[PDB]
PDB file of C-alpha atoms and ligand atoms in Angstrom:
ATOM      1  CA  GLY A   1     -11.500 -13.927 -29.633  1.00 32.00           C
ATOM      2  CA  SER A   2     -15.273 -13.671 -29.983  1.00 29.24           C
ATOM      3  CA  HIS A   3     -18.292 -12.066 -28.327  1.00 27.59           C
ATOM      4  CA  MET A   4     -19.459 -15.577 -27.406  1.00 30.31           C
ATOM      5  CA  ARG A   5     -16.207 -16.256 -25.565  1.00 33.69           C
ATOM      6  CA  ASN A   6     -16.371 -12.953 -23.702  1.00 34.89           C
ATOM      7  CA  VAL A   7     -19.917 -13.546 -22.528  1.00 32.20           C
ATOM      8  CA  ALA A   8     -18.914 -17.062 -21.445  1.00 34.12           C
ATOM      9  CA  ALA A   9     -15.966 -15.606 -19.567  1.00 33.92           C
ATOM     10  CA  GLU A  10     -18.259 -13.253 -17.663  1.00 32.26           C
ATOM     11  CA  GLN A  11     -20.338 -16.276 -16.677  1.00 29.46           C
ATOM     12  CA  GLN A  12     -17.144 -18.040 -15.519  1.00 32.29           C
ATOM     13  CA  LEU A  13     -16.355 -15.011 -13.350  1.00 27.84           C
ATOM     14  CA  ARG A  14     -19.807 -15.246 -11.755  1.00 28.40           C
ATOM     15  CA  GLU A  15     -19.143 -18.912 -11.057  1.00 30.01           C
ATOM     16  CA  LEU A  16     -15.692 -18.131  -9.642  1.00 29.52           C
ATOM     17  CA  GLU A  17     -17.164 -15.556  -7.273  1.00 30.13           C
ATOM     18  CA  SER A  18     -19.741 -18.083  -6.053  1.00 33.11           C
ATOM     19  CA  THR A  19     -16.873 -20.283  -4.783  1.00 35.01           C
ATOM     20  CA  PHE A  20     -15.863 -17.837  -2.035  1.00 36.07           C
ATOM     21  CA  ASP A  21     -17.604 -15.612   0.489  1.00 34.10           C
ATOM     22  CA  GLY A  22     -16.733 -12.245  -1.008  1.00 34.54           C
ATOM     23  CA  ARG A  23     -16.901  -9.930  -4.015  1.00 35.01           C
ATOM     24  CA  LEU A  24     -14.935 -10.122  -7.257  1.00 36.29           C
ATOM     25  CA  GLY A  25     -14.456  -6.894  -9.193  1.00 34.08           C
ATOM     26  CA  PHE A  26     -12.916  -7.567 -12.573  1.00 34.29           C
ATOM     27  CA  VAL A  27     -12.210  -5.814 -15.856  1.00 36.05           C
ATOM     28  CA  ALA A  28     -10.021  -7.111 -18.628  1.00 34.14           C
ATOM     29  CA  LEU A  29      -9.583  -5.164 -21.844  1.00 34.15           C
ATOM     30  CA  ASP A  30      -8.206  -6.457 -25.107  1.00 33.31           C
ATOM     31  CA  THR A  31      -6.618  -3.325 -26.540  1.00 32.64           C
ATOM     32  CA  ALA A  32      -6.726  -4.725 -30.066  1.00 32.02           C
ATOM     33  CA  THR A  33     -10.466  -3.886 -30.129  1.00 33.03           C
ATOM     34  CA  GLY A  34     -11.460  -2.572 -26.698  1.00 32.73           C
ATOM     35  CA  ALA A  35     -13.382  -5.780 -26.043  1.00 32.07           C
ATOM     36  CA  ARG A  36     -14.176  -6.071 -22.340  1.00 34.87           C
ATOM     37  CA  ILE A  37     -14.685  -8.932 -19.924  1.00 36.47           C
ATOM     38  CA  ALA A  38     -16.118  -7.662 -16.657  1.00 35.67           C
ATOM     39  CA  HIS A  39     -17.781  -8.418 -13.362  1.00 37.20           C
ATOM     40  CA  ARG A  40     -19.041  -5.740 -10.925  1.00 37.08           C
ATOM     41  CA  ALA A  41     -17.279  -3.221 -13.145  1.00 39.36           C
ATOM     42  CA  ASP A  42     -18.969  -0.195 -11.601  1.00 40.39           C
ATOM     43  CA  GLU A  43     -18.904  -1.132  -7.913  1.00 40.21           C
ATOM     44  CA  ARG A  44     -16.422   0.530  -5.559  1.00 39.66           C
ATOM     45  CA  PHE A  45     -13.646  -1.550  -3.957  1.00 39.41           C
ATOM     46  CA  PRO A  46     -10.814  -0.602  -1.573  1.00 36.04           C
ATOM     47  CA  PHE A  47      -7.804  -0.222  -3.857  1.00 35.70           C
ATOM     48  CA  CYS A  48      -5.174  -0.742  -1.160  1.00 36.64           C
ATOM     49  CA  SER A  49      -1.658  -0.663  -2.546  1.00 38.92           C
ATOM     50  CA  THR A  50      -2.773  -0.630  -6.202  1.00 38.58           C
ATOM     51  CA  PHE A  51      -2.968   3.174  -5.858  1.00 42.49           C
ATOM     52  CA  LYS A  52       0.856   3.265  -5.882  1.00 43.67           C
ATOM     53  CA  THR A  53       0.650   3.110  -9.690  1.00 45.91           C
ATOM     54  CA  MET A  54      -1.437   6.322  -9.771  1.00 46.38           C
ATOM     55  CA  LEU A  55       0.931   7.843  -7.191  1.00 45.98           C
ATOM     56  CA  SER A  56       4.043   7.030  -9.226  1.00 46.73           C
ATOM     57  CA  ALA A  57       2.417   8.348 -12.398  1.00 48.56           C
ATOM     58  CA  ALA A  58       1.658  11.635 -10.624  1.00 47.47           C
ATOM     59  CA  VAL A  59       5.310  11.891  -9.602  1.00 46.51           C
ATOM     60  CA  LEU A  60       6.417  11.205 -13.179  1.00 46.48           C
ATOM     61  CA  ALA A  61       4.037  13.823 -14.530  1.00 45.49           C
ATOM     62  CA  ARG A  62       5.389  16.410 -12.095  1.00 47.91           C
ATOM     63  CA  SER A  63       8.924  15.464 -13.112  1.00 43.31           C
ATOM     64  CA  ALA A  64       8.170  16.332 -16.729  1.00 41.07           C
ATOM     65  CA  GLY A  65       8.197  20.036 -15.846  1.00 41.46           C
ATOM     66  CA  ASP A  66      10.280  19.925 -12.672  1.00 41.19           C
ATOM     67  CA  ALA A  67      13.948  19.566 -13.594  1.00 43.82           C
ATOM     68  CA  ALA A  68      15.853  16.863 -11.699  1.00 42.59           C
ATOM     69  CA  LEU A  69      12.882  16.042  -9.420  1.00 40.29           C
ATOM     70  CA  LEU A  70      13.539  12.327  -9.903  1.00 42.96           C
ATOM     71  CA  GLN A  71      17.108  12.827  -8.672  1.00 41.58           C
ATOM     72  CA  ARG A  72      16.142  14.700  -5.512  1.00 38.30           C
ATOM     73  CA  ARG A  73      17.045  12.741  -2.386  1.00 40.35           C
ATOM     74  CA  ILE A  74      14.567  12.844   0.499  1.00 38.86           C
ATOM     75  CA  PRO A  75      16.010  12.226   3.986  1.00 38.15           C
ATOM     76  CA  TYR A  76      14.008  10.434   6.671  1.00 37.39           C
ATOM     77  CA  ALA A  77      14.724   8.830  10.038  1.00 39.00           C
ATOM     78  CA  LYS A  78      13.980   5.387  11.454  1.00 39.41           C
ATOM     79  CA  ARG A  79      11.201   6.943  13.544  1.00 40.93           C
ATOM     80  CA  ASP A  80       9.584   8.066  10.256  1.00 42.73           C
ATOM     81  CA  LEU A  81       9.236   4.487   8.971  1.00 45.42           C
ATOM     82  CA  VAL A  82       5.743   3.146   8.355  1.00 46.56           C
ATOM     83  CA  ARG A  83       4.900  -0.554   8.836  1.00 48.92           C
ATOM     84  CA  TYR A  84       6.284  -2.564   5.874  1.00 51.59           C
ATOM     85  CA  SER A  85       9.287  -0.659   4.572  1.00 53.16           C
ATOM     86  CA  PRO A  86      11.476  -3.393   3.095  1.00 52.56           C
ATOM     87  CA  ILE A  87      13.596  -1.014   0.971  1.00 54.82           C
ATOM     88  CA  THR A  88      13.385   2.320   2.795  1.00 55.37           C
ATOM     89  CA  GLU A  89      14.381   0.757   6.133  1.00 55.47           C
ATOM     90  CA  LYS A  90      17.824   0.099   4.567  1.00 56.04           C
ATOM     91  CA  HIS A  91      18.427   3.760   3.675  1.00 51.53           C
ATOM     92  CA  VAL A  92      17.474   5.667   6.833  1.00 54.90           C
ATOM     93  CA  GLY A  93      19.399   8.922   7.257  1.00 52.58           C
ATOM     94  CA  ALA A  94      20.244  10.505   3.912  1.00 56.14           C
ATOM     95  CA  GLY A  95      17.318   8.644   2.370  1.00 51.84           C
ATOM     96  CA  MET A  96      16.610   7.760  -1.258  1.00 52.34           C
ATOM     97  CA  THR A  97      16.031   9.588  -4.526  1.00 52.81           C
ATOM     98  CA  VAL A  98      12.515  10.196  -5.788  1.00 52.59           C
ATOM     99  CA  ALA A  99      13.130   7.711  -8.608  1.00 51.75           C
ATOM    100  CA  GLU A 100      14.342   5.106  -6.128  1.00 54.69           C
ATOM    101  CA  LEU A 101      11.271   5.696  -3.961  1.00 56.31           C
ATOM    102  CA  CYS A 102       8.979   5.169  -6.956  1.00 59.42           C
ATOM    103  CA  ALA A 103      10.798   1.948  -7.770  1.00 59.11           C
ATOM    104  CA  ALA A 104      10.573   0.765  -4.159  1.00 57.84           C
ATOM    105  CA  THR A 105       6.895   1.541  -3.781  1.00 57.97           C
ATOM    106  CA  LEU A 106       6.009  -0.094  -7.126  1.00 59.42           C
ATOM    107  CA  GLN A 107       8.241  -3.167  -6.966  1.00 62.68           C
ATOM    108  CA  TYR A 108       8.118  -3.954  -3.259  1.00 62.80           C
ATOM    109  CA  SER A 109       4.997  -2.016  -2.211  1.00 63.13           C
ATOM    110  CA  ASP A 110       7.168  -0.074   0.265  1.00 61.06           C
ATOM    111  CA  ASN A 111       4.904   1.986   2.526  1.00 63.12           C
ATOM    112  CA  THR A 112       7.346   4.629   3.731  1.00 60.42           C
ATOM    113  CA  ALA A 113       8.255   5.237   0.101  1.00 58.76           C
ATOM    114  CA  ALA A 114       4.573   5.784  -0.694  1.00 59.19           C
ATOM    115  CA  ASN A 115       4.081   8.220   2.177  1.00 56.90           C
ATOM    116  CA  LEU A 116       7.218  10.165   1.239  1.00 55.89           C
ATOM    117  CA  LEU A 117       5.891  10.534  -2.319  1.00 55.13           C
ATOM    118  CA  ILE A 118       2.372  11.467  -1.181  1.00 56.47           C
ATOM    119  CA  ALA A 119       3.885  14.183   1.014  1.00 60.82           C
ATOM    120  CA  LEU A 120       6.172  15.393  -1.804  1.00 60.59           C
ATOM    121  CA  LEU A 121       3.115  15.946  -4.026  1.00 61.44           C
ATOM    122  CA  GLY A 122       1.323  17.868  -1.285  1.00 63.78           C
ATOM    123  CA  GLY A 123      -0.945  15.213   0.183  1.00 62.32           C
ATOM    124  CA  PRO A 124      -3.480  12.544  -0.867  1.00 59.38           C
ATOM    125  CA  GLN A 125      -5.654  15.085  -2.674  1.00 60.76           C
ATOM    126  CA  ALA A 126      -2.801  15.703  -5.123  1.00 64.12           C
ATOM    127  CA  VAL A 127      -2.999  12.078  -6.196  1.00 59.88           C
ATOM    128  CA  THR A 128      -6.758  12.400  -6.647  1.00 61.35           C
ATOM    129  CA  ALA A 129      -6.241  15.595  -8.619  1.00 58.04           C
ATOM    130  CA  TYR A 130      -3.786  13.756 -10.852  1.00 58.44           C
ATOM    131  CA  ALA A 131      -6.344  11.022 -11.489  1.00 56.51           C
ATOM    132  CA  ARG A 132      -8.882  13.659 -12.523  1.00 53.61           C
ATOM    133  CA  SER A 133      -6.330  15.058 -14.979  1.00 54.64           C
ATOM    134  CA  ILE A 134      -6.127  11.730 -16.813  1.00 57.28           C
ATOM    135  CA  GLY A 135      -9.891  11.353 -16.986  1.00 59.04           C
ATOM    136  CA  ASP A 136     -10.528   9.322 -13.857  1.00 58.22           C
ATOM    137  CA  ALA A 137     -13.557  10.819 -12.087  1.00 58.08           C
ATOM    138  CA  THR A 138     -13.887   7.840  -9.749  1.00 59.03           C
ATOM    139  CA  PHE A 139     -10.549   7.265  -8.024  1.00 59.90           C
ATOM    140  CA  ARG A 140     -10.111   8.897  -4.617  1.00 54.76           C
ATOM    141  CA  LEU A 141      -7.131   8.834  -2.278  1.00 57.46           C
ATOM    142  CA  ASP A 142      -8.067  10.101   1.154  1.00 55.30           C
ATOM    143  CA  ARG A 143      -5.558   8.603   3.573  1.00 60.80           C
ATOM    144  CA  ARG A 144      -1.907   7.576   3.735  1.00 58.19           C
ATOM    145  CA  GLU A 145      -0.236   4.264   4.512  1.00 59.91           C
ATOM    146  CA  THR A 146      -1.183   2.189   6.268  1.00 60.83           C
ATOM    147  CA  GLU A 147      -4.595   3.567   7.259  1.00 61.29           C
ATOM    148  CA  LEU A 148      -5.912   3.468   3.671  1.00 61.06           C
ATOM    149  CA  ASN A 149      -5.940  -0.361   3.808  1.00 60.24           C
ATOM    150  CA  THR A 150      -8.107  -0.558   6.892  1.00 59.11           C
ATOM    151  CA  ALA A 151     -11.773  -0.872   7.694  1.00 65.81           C
ATOM    152  CA  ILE A 152     -12.803   1.272  10.652  1.00 67.76           C
ATOM    153  CA  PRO A 163     -19.575  -1.209   2.285  1.00 68.43           C
ATOM    154  CA  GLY A 164     -20.517   2.409   2.941  1.00 65.89           C
ATOM    155  CA  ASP A 165     -17.036   3.890   3.357  1.00 63.57           C
ATOM    156  CA  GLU A 166     -15.962   5.290  -0.014  1.00 64.50           C
ATOM    157  CA  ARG A 167     -12.546   6.519   1.132  1.00 68.54           C
ATOM    158  CA  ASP A 168      -9.580   5.130  -0.794  1.00 66.83           C
ATOM    159  CA  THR A 169     -11.717   3.358  -3.377  1.00 66.16           C
ATOM    160  CA  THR A 170     -12.207   3.099  -7.092  1.00 66.94           C
ATOM    161  CA  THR A 171     -14.174   0.899  -9.489  1.00 64.13           C
ATOM    162  CA  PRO A 172     -12.684  -1.869 -11.636  1.00 64.66           C
ATOM    163  CA  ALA A 173     -13.805   0.005 -14.787  1.00 63.59           C
ATOM    164  CA  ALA A 174     -12.274   3.315 -13.728  1.00 65.12           C
ATOM    165  CA  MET A 175      -9.017   1.706 -12.757  1.00 64.21           C
ATOM    166  CA  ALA A 176      -8.846  -0.328 -15.971  1.00 63.22           C
ATOM    167  CA  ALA A 177      -9.271   2.793 -18.055  1.00 59.89           C
ATOM    168  CA  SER A 178      -6.595   4.576 -16.018  1.00 57.73           C
ATOM    169  CA  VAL A 179      -4.159   1.652 -16.183  1.00 56.44           C
ATOM    170  CA  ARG A 180      -4.697   1.453 -19.941  1.00 59.09           C
ATOM    171  CA  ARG A 181      -4.118   5.183 -20.392  1.00 57.35           C
ATOM    172  CA  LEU A 182      -1.020   5.211 -18.187  1.00 60.80           C
ATOM    173  CA  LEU A 183       0.794   2.129 -19.480  1.00 65.64           C
ATOM    174  CA  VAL A 184      -0.379   1.813 -23.098  1.00 65.58           C
ATOM    175  CA  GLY A 185      -2.097   5.074 -23.941  1.00 65.82           C
ATOM    176  CA  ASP A 186      -1.779   8.823 -23.779  1.00 65.01           C
ATOM    177  CA  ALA A 187      -1.776   9.788 -20.103  1.00 63.66           C
ATOM    178  CA  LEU A 188       1.998  10.239 -19.809  1.00 64.31           C
ATOM    179  CA  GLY A 189       4.709  11.446 -22.159  1.00 64.91           C
ATOM    180  CA  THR A 190       6.570   8.696 -24.004  1.00 66.75           C
ATOM    181  CA  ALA A 191       9.626   8.696 -21.714  1.00 67.17           C
ATOM    182  CA  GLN A 192       7.503   8.770 -18.577  1.00 68.30           C
ATOM    183  CA  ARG A 193       5.244   5.967 -19.844  1.00 68.75           C
ATOM    184  CA  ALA A 194       8.359   3.921 -20.617  1.00 70.17           C
ATOM    185  CA  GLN A 195       9.681   4.528 -17.108  1.00 70.96           C
ATOM    186  CA  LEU A 196       6.422   3.526 -15.422  1.00 67.12           C
ATOM    187  CA  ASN A 197       6.257   0.311 -17.454  1.00 66.29           C
ATOM    188  CA  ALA A 198       9.926  -0.390 -16.681  1.00 64.11           C
ATOM    189  CA  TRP A 199       9.289  -0.153 -12.955  1.00 63.00           C
ATOM    190  CA  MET A 200       6.057  -2.162 -12.948  1.00 62.47           C
ATOM    191  CA  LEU A 201       7.478  -4.902 -15.202  1.00 64.31           C
ATOM    192  CA  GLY A 202      10.009  -5.351 -12.398  1.00 63.41           C
ATOM    193  CA  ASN A 203       7.353  -5.940  -9.743  1.00 62.36           C
ATOM    194  CA  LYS A 204       8.369  -8.547  -7.141  1.00 63.72           C
ATOM    195  CA  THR A 205       5.086  -9.003  -5.261  1.00 62.82           C
ATOM    196  CA  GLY A 206       2.775 -10.366  -7.955  1.00 63.17           C
ATOM    197  CA  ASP A 207       4.039 -13.853  -8.821  1.00 59.75           C
ATOM    198  CA  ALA A 208       0.907 -15.593  -7.500  1.00 62.52           C
ATOM    199  CA  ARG A 209      -1.660 -13.196  -8.977  1.00 60.57           C
ATOM    200  CA  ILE A 210      -2.157 -11.983 -12.604  1.00 60.77           C
ATOM    201  CA  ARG A 211       1.273 -13.416 -13.517  1.00 60.42           C
ATOM    202  CA  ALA A 212       0.161 -16.871 -12.390  1.00 61.36           C
ATOM    203  CA  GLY A 213      -2.842 -16.730 -14.732  1.00 60.11           C
ATOM    204  CA  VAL A 214      -1.133 -15.884 -18.032  1.00 60.06           C
ATOM    205  CA  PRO A 215       1.114 -17.819 -20.454  1.00 57.68           C
ATOM    206  CA  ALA A 216       4.843 -17.957 -19.710  1.00 59.61           C
ATOM    207  CA  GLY A 217       5.699 -15.626 -22.588  1.00 63.15           C
ATOM    208  CA  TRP A 218       3.479 -12.730 -21.557  1.00 61.11           C
ATOM    209  CA  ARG A 219       5.304 -10.063 -19.630  1.00 62.80           C
ATOM    210  CA  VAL A 220       3.224  -8.408 -16.954  1.00 61.20           C
ATOM    211  CA  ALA A 221       3.500  -4.874 -15.630  1.00 61.79           C
ATOM    212  CA  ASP A 222       1.438  -5.098 -12.446  1.00 60.30           C
ATOM    213  CA  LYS A 223       0.893  -3.693  -8.986  1.00 58.38           C
ATOM    214  CA  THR A 224      -0.719  -5.675  -6.185  1.00 61.25           C
ATOM    215  CA  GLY A 225      -2.696  -4.612  -3.140  1.00 60.41           C
ATOM    216  CA  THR A 226      -3.622  -6.314   0.102  1.00 59.37           C
ATOM    217  CA  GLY A 227      -5.783  -5.113   2.988  1.00 59.03           C
ATOM    218  CA  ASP A 228      -8.384  -5.877   5.654  1.00 59.40           C
ATOM    219  CA  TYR A 229     -11.318  -8.213   4.995  1.00 60.71           C
ATOM    220  CA  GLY A 230      -8.983 -10.444   2.956  1.00 60.03           C
ATOM    221  CA  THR A 231      -8.703  -7.776   0.275  1.00 61.25           C
ATOM    222  CA  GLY A 232      -6.524  -9.039  -2.569  1.00 61.86           C
ATOM    223  CA  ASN A 233      -5.933  -6.923  -5.647  1.00 60.98           C
ATOM    224  CA  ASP A 234      -3.781  -6.825  -8.755  1.00 59.70           C
ATOM    225  CA  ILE A 235      -3.814  -4.349 -11.632  1.00 62.52           C
ATOM    226  CA  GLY A 236      -1.721  -4.025 -14.727  1.00 64.34           C
ATOM    227  CA  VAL A 237      -1.089  -4.849 -18.366  1.00 66.80           C
ATOM    228  CA  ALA A 238       0.070  -8.079 -19.975  1.00 68.46           C
ATOM    229  CA  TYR A 239       2.209  -7.855 -23.098  1.00 65.99           C
ATOM    230  CA  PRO A 240       2.043 -10.889 -25.391  1.00 67.03           C
ATOM    231  CA  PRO A 241       4.962 -10.958 -27.841  1.00 66.13           C
ATOM    232  CA  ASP A 242       2.696 -11.348 -30.854  1.00 69.49           C
ATOM    233  CA  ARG A 243      -0.491  -9.345 -30.245  1.00 70.82           C
ATOM    234  CA  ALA A 244      -2.026  -6.308 -28.541  1.00 70.40           C
ATOM    235  CA  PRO A 245      -1.584  -5.687 -24.811  1.00 76.25           C
ATOM    236  CA  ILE A 246      -4.326  -6.830 -22.438  1.00 74.10           C
ATOM    237  CA  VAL A 247      -5.345  -4.776 -19.389  1.00 75.56           C
ATOM    238  CA  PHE A 248      -6.218  -6.667 -16.190  1.00 76.24           C
ATOM    239  CA  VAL A 249      -7.866  -5.206 -13.126  1.00 74.37           C
ATOM    240  CA  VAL A 250      -8.747  -7.608 -10.323  1.00 72.52           C
ATOM    241  CA  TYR A 251     -10.217  -6.461  -7.016  1.00 71.78           C
ATOM    242  CA  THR A 252     -11.389  -8.953  -4.417  1.00 75.24           C
ATOM    243  CA  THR A 253     -12.663  -8.386  -0.922  1.00 76.54           C
ATOM    244  CA  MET A 254     -14.293 -10.743   1.575  1.00 80.35           C
ATOM    245  CA  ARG A 255     -17.307 -10.603   3.852  1.00 76.79           C
ATOM    246  CA  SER A 256     -15.464 -11.740   6.995  1.00 77.26           C
ATOM    247  CA  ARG A 257     -12.990  -9.404   8.698  1.00 77.24           C
ATOM    248  CA  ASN A 258     -10.891 -12.477   9.585  1.00 79.03           C
ATOM    249  CA  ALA A 259     -10.597 -13.554   5.946  1.00 80.56           C
ATOM    250  CA  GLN A 260      -7.346 -14.231   4.138  1.00 81.95           C
ATOM    251  CA  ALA A 261      -6.702 -12.885   0.654  1.00 80.84           C
ATOM    252  CA  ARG A 262      -7.065 -15.371  -2.182  1.00 82.50           C
ATOM    253  CA  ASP A 263      -4.152 -15.412  -4.636  1.00 84.22           C
ATOM    254  CA  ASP A 264      -5.695 -18.446  -6.326  1.00 83.96           C
ATOM    255  CA  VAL A 265      -8.933 -16.593  -7.081  1.00 85.60           C
ATOM    256  CA  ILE A 266      -7.044 -13.615  -8.506  1.00 83.99           C
ATOM    257  CA  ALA A 267      -4.939 -15.864 -10.715  1.00 83.98           C
ATOM    258  CA  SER A 268      -8.040 -17.799 -11.828  1.00 85.24           C
ATOM    259  CA  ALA A 269      -9.878 -14.615 -12.728  1.00 83.80           C
ATOM    260  CA  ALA A 270      -6.943 -13.440 -14.847  1.00 82.64           C
ATOM    261  CA  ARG A 271      -6.725 -16.898 -16.459  1.00 80.76           C
ATOM    262  CA  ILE A 272     -10.386 -16.739 -17.471  1.00 80.35           C
ATOM    263  CA  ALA A 273      -9.841 -13.533 -19.429  1.00 79.56           C
ATOM    264  CA  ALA A 274      -6.446 -14.515 -20.859  1.00 82.40           C
ATOM    265  CA  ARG A 275      -7.942 -17.711 -22.275  1.00 84.87           C
ATOM    266  CA  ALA A 276     -11.040 -15.968 -23.621  1.00 84.12           C
ATOM    267  CA  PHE A 277      -9.088 -13.247 -25.445  1.00 87.88           C
ATOM    268  CA  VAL A 278      -6.346 -15.425 -26.933  1.00 88.70           C
TER     269      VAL A 278
HETATM  270  C1  CB4 B 301       3.576  -8.535   1.425  1.00 90.19           C
HETATM  271  C2  CB4 B 301       2.588  -7.675   0.707  1.00 90.19           C
HETATM  272  C3  CB4 B 301       1.561  -8.564   0.087  1.00 90.19           C
HETATM  273  O1  CB4 B 301       1.961  -6.827   1.604  1.00 90.19           O
HETATM  274  N1  CB4 B 301       2.347  -5.597   1.788  1.00 90.19           N
HETATM  275  C4  CB4 B 301       2.124  -5.041   2.946  1.00 90.19           C
HETATM  276  C5  CB4 B 301       1.366  -3.782   3.014  1.00 90.19           C
HETATM  277  O2  CB4 B 301       1.212  -3.028   3.963  1.00 90.19           O
HETATM  278  N2  CB4 B 301       0.782  -3.500   1.793  1.00 90.19           N
HETATM  279  C6  CB4 B 301      -0.006  -2.368   1.614  1.00 90.19           C
HETATM  280  B1  CB4 B 301      -0.500  -2.787   0.097  1.00 90.19           B
HETATM  281  O3  CB4 B 301       0.381  -3.768  -0.529  1.00 90.19           O
HETATM  282  O4  CB4 B 301      -1.905  -2.981  -0.052  1.00 90.19           O
HETATM  283  C7  CB4 B 301       2.692  -5.634   4.150  1.00 90.19           C
HETATM  284  C8  CB4 B 301       2.470  -5.105   5.427  1.00 90.19           C
HETATM  285  S1  CB4 B 301       3.379  -6.139   6.403  1.00 90.19           S
HETATM  286  C9  CB4 B 301       3.971  -7.191   5.222  1.00 90.19           C
HETATM  287  N3  CB4 B 301       4.823  -8.324   5.385  1.00 90.19           N
HETATM  288  N4  CB4 B 301       3.493  -6.741   4.056  1.00 90.19           N
HETATM  289  C10 CB4 B 301       3.301  -6.925  -0.376  1.00 90.19           C
HETATM  290  O5  CB4 B 301       4.406  -6.370  -0.133  1.00 90.19           O
HETATM  291  O6  CB4 B 301       2.809  -6.852  -1.538  1.00 90.19           O
END
């Protein structure tokens, strides 16, 4: 790694953004030194499902002082299901444990699981309050699934910046936001993600294991956040937010993977 390479990488990100009609928000952090590669680091983007990492962390933090919270089973009916409930739709009735709901929302992006957990914590503002408690003054959760993914720009609801989210992801997965057992559990879940094969994972070498959470929304919004763990050097934090100008736009997995690849190559 070198300063020269990082500056060149930021230029490559500018060039990558020029290839599509949208915005690229990007922060990668090499935790060996805190070196950063960024683009639009301080602009707000809709986080979409990437908030499920902050949500699950809040649940884990509560569980640290709330005996057997993770084992509590929350019942729900078929009429309670939100659009896109690939795991929870199989357990209607008695429901699933809090731990199982965290796993479902992180690994499959299950929306009913997310809403059940948001409600358990006392509403969206409890997730925001948790973010504040780990030093994130930027993150805000205002709505539930699936409304938080939608456009009804100037709307700041359900947004964060790439820089704020990178710091929070670093603190949660590598640093000192959670207790050691809780940090290990969050990593364990996110390393098992099933929805990110075409995003950050597609931009890093085959030996780097990636704990990530994706997000997708209106205006072709395509996001992925997480940490890559090389076997032989310090973890690297990746935050990629993309959103398009056209409401009809598709998300761009290829752009997300290319952005990650730019930083992975520059750092190592
Ligand atoms: C598939 C993919 C990308 O998308 N997930 C959703 C969904 O609502 N995601 C909210 B979030 O991932 O931003 C979804 C709604 S209908 C459907 N199929 N998927 C995901 O699970 O990650």
